[PDB]
Amino acid sequence: KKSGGSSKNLGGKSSGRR
Amino acid sequence: FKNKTVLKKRCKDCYLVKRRGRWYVYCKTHPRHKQRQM
Amino acid sequence: GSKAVTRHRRVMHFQRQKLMAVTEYIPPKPAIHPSCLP
Amino acid sequence: KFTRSRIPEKVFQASPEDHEKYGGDPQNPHKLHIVTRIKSTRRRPYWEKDIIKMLGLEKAHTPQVHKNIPSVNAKLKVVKHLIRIKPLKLPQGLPAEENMSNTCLKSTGELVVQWHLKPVEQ
Amino acid sequence: AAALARLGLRPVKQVRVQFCPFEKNVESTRTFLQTVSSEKVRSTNLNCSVIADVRHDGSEPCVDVLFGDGHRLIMRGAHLTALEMLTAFASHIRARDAAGS
Amino acid sequence: RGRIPGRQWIGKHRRPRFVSLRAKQNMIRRLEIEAENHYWLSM
Amino acid sequence: VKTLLPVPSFEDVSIPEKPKLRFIERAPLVPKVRREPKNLSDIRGPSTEATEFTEGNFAILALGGGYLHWGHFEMMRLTINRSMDPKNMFAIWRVPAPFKPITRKSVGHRMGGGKGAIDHYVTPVKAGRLVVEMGGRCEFEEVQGFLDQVAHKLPFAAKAVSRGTLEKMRKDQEERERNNQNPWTFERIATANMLGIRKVLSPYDLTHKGKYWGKFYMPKRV
RNA sequence: UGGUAUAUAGUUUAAACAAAACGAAUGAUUUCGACUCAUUAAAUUAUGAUAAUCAUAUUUACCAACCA
RNA sequence: CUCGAUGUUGGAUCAGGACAUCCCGAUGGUGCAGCCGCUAUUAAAGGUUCGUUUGUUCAACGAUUAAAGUCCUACGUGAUCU
RNA sequence: CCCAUAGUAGGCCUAAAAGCAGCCACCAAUUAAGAAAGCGUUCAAGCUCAACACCCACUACCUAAAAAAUCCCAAACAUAUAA
Ligand code: FES
Ligand SMILES: [K+]
Ligand SMILES: [K+]
Ligand SMILES: [K+]
Ligand SMILES: [K+]
Ligand SMILES: [Mg+2]
Ligand SMILES: [Mg+2]
Ligand SMILES: [Mg+2]
Ligand SMILES: [Mg+2]
Ligand SMILES: [Mg+2]
Ligand SMILES: [Mg+2]
Ligand SMILES: [Mg+2]
Ligand SMILES: [Mg+2]
Ligand SMILES: [Mg+2]
Ligand SMILES: [Mg+2]
Ligand SMILES: [Mg+2]
Ligand SMILES: [Mg+2]
Ligand SMILES: [Mg+2]
Ligand SMILES: [Mg+2]
Ligand SMILES: [Mg+2]
Ligand SMILES: [Mg+2]
Ligand SMILES: [Mg+2]
Ligand SMILES: [Zn+2]
């Protein structure tokens, strides 16, 4: 019912460099 | 009386006494000090 | 499940519950009670 | 996280009051072990299950003999809660070639080289 | 003194206490006299007298109580405590007071 | 009366389990073995 | 001849200019924007700060971990400032003002949608810490009345103590550890991983030695 | 029941250390008045804490709601 | 858990049960004189109205009653109804 | 349990402030008793406590509750040598 806000943080999906 | 989990005397004439398996507080001077263990 | 810190006391694993029961303080008992002695 | 455990060294330091309880001699240490599994590897980590195979302790209540040396002892310190360790005693000494088929390992840890199966006349 | 003052020496007419101080059984009687001779008890009935006659005849101590009705109460305190003497004394006060009224 | 909410031995509100006397002795018997194991692994 | 005794003299004691407890603000001066994790291990285990007396002689000891918000500080402040004599007593704070932000989502919303907004601030407290410290020209029996009254209203197990009772508490616990007739202890077993017991234990149990379970402290445990 | 707003002279109304407006008085002004101008009097819903800012309950306003 | 179907509002009908008691019963306290009330202890055998508007549950209103109780029972009950 | 007289209604403030609305002092009589710790009075009165005397109260100061709806819920047991 009551809608909710979204997250304002984007990115942070980088993978490990090994 | 008034059911109390923590009995406490409110004057010098209150006296503790165990009756009917539980503690009571009686007072002849001020009968409003009477309490029953809950 | 439940976090490690809880407002309520969290039930232990039975192995831990048994450990806590074995590792209980046992006070020393003198062979004769000190009151019986002069 | 659940991990492997590092046992401190002070744990494996016999005290003077420990030698007068088990009957050991720190100056004349025993040469061989008598290890016997008395606990299941189920519900234990995989690294404990592998050590039990290296030591030949698959079947339980089956005495196995190992050498009392650091490398072997180290493997035993990882599964010391699944086994029973007892020193091997040789009241008659090492079995000779003519006694290999007359031996018997008793519950006391002694290896007797003359298993006659007859009441003592004494 | 407190317990005996709430009651009051209304019916009593005279009280007499005799004891031998040097004798070693008069502590009870001397304690009885210490309370009855209090200002709280004596005030309730001024008419009621309280007399103490000391003696050294080697005799036992007694408490003689005269009432208005004419009845008398005697307590030989050699083998009686102050509380026993006081208690019996009070009970008679209540009985005689009710009889008069 | 006496319902345990949900499944007995999981979750937040579980059925209480109490340690018997032989359960203590059984654990102590195991400890005495492993304590003697430390002595033979020390020489 | 009832034997009288000497009495201690507090003439050598000094009273500050503001003996009463200062006011604590709901939130810090500058509001925080970076939202923080729950970090429950700030109330777990023994305390490593504010475990000793500094100026006073009586205090409230924490026997468990918890978080303190403004409502708790007001109750302690008013209750103490009302019941204490400013002339012969003084009090100070042994805990900082609320700084840890607590987020909270709006009513009726489902799981997800990011993280909530900062609602209020708290002060984390560990077991064994002093919350309020008092002192002055007074005995312990005087302050013990309203200090215990305060300790009972706190969200954790607390208790009023003095320089003597606190010391005695600690020496009695050490005495218990020495004269304990039980040959088996939690420390010995855990450190040696006897019975594979570290499969049901925590790495913190190597240091807490069974005296702590979450935020709760058990003084009867040796 | 729920929250959300609410309060200033006698009223009316910006703003809290108290500003202006109607009315009141006072003079100035006019032959006398009205108007105008000037002056004067006149207040912060009351309770507890921060020390004058948050709470506290009132106060009247403002929307919310069995359900299929 | 159930979508190769667990028919869902309120009402009618019949009600089972809990007590955290609305009335009737027994008690302590009162800022209980008395008549009325406030509060707590105990008690669940028995009982707990008819109507106007609204689909309503509620709510308001009128006239009464010793009182017109709070809740659960697949928001009790549609192979009984509406 | 027992018991309580006194400089004095200390000073100041205050309409009044007398041990007990506030501020200052907190000295002294008597073998013994706070210029007063808790009630109380419009202010006073009045009741207790700490004191003496008497003689043994010659304590504990470590924890305080519980209610739902079909019908409680194995039956039972404190004393014959750890198997
Ligand atoms: S039994 Fe030894 S003192 Fe009472
Ligand atoms: K459960
Ligand atoms: K608490
Ligand atoms: K379905
Ligand atoms: K005065
Ligand atoms: Mg990353
Ligand atoms: Mg990734
Ligand atoms: Mg987890
Ligand atoms: Mg279940
Ligand atoms: Mg089907
Ligand atoms: Mg009832
Ligand atoms: Mg009924
Ligand atoms: Mg239904
Ligand atoms: Mg049909
Ligand atoms: Mg049906
Ligand atoms: Mg004067
Ligand atoms: Mg004075
Ligand atoms: Mg007086
Ligand atoms: Mg007064
Ligand atoms: Mg005086
Ligand atoms: Mg004074
Ligand atoms: Mg006294
Ligand atoms: Zn009383």
Short mmCIF file of C-alpha atoms (C1' of nucleotides) in Angstrom, two decimals, chain H residues 24-55:
data_model
loop_
_atom_site.label_atom_id
_atom_site.label_comp_id
_atom_site.label_asym_id
_atom_site.label_seq_id
_atom_site.Cartn_x
_atom_site.Cartn_y
_atom_site.Cartn_z
"C1'" A H 24 -10.32 55.46 24.39
"C1'" A H 25 -8.13 59.90 26.41
"C1'" U H 26 -5.21 64.26 25.52
"C1'" G H 27 -4.03 68.41 23.37
"C1'" A H 28 -2.72 71.13 18.35
"C1'" U H 29 -6.07 73.04 14.78
"C1'" U H 30 -11.38 75.56 13.57
"C1'" U H 31 -16.46 80.63 14.73
"C1'" C H 32 -17.79 75.52 16.75
"C1'" G H 33 -17.01 70.55 14.55
"C1'" A H 34 -15.57 66.41 11.14
"C1'" C H 35 -10.97 65.10 8.90
"C1'" U H 36 -5.86 65.30 9.77
"C1'" C H 37 -1.50 65.60 12.86
"C1'" A H 38 0.85 64.74 17.70
"C1'" U H 39 0.84 62.53 22.46
"C1'" U H 40 -0.80 59.17 26.34
"C1'" A H 41 -2.90 54.67 28.50
"C1'" A H 42 -3.30 49.52 27.24
"C1'" A H 43 -1.01 42.42 26.06
"C1'" U H 44 2.20 37.83 24.90
"C1'" U H 45 -3.46 30.13 26.65
"C1'" A H 46 -1.69 29.49 31.23
"C1'" U H 47 1.70 25.02 33.70
"C1'" G H 48 7.28 22.30 34.30
"C1'" A H 49 12.60 22.27 32.49
"C1'" U H 50 16.85 24.79 28.49
"C1'" A H 51 17.64 29.81 30.15
"C1'" A H 52 13.84 32.46 27.51
"C1'" U H 53 14.02 26.79 24.13
"C1'" C H 54 12.27 22.38 24.22
"C1'" A H 55 8.41 19.62 26.82
#
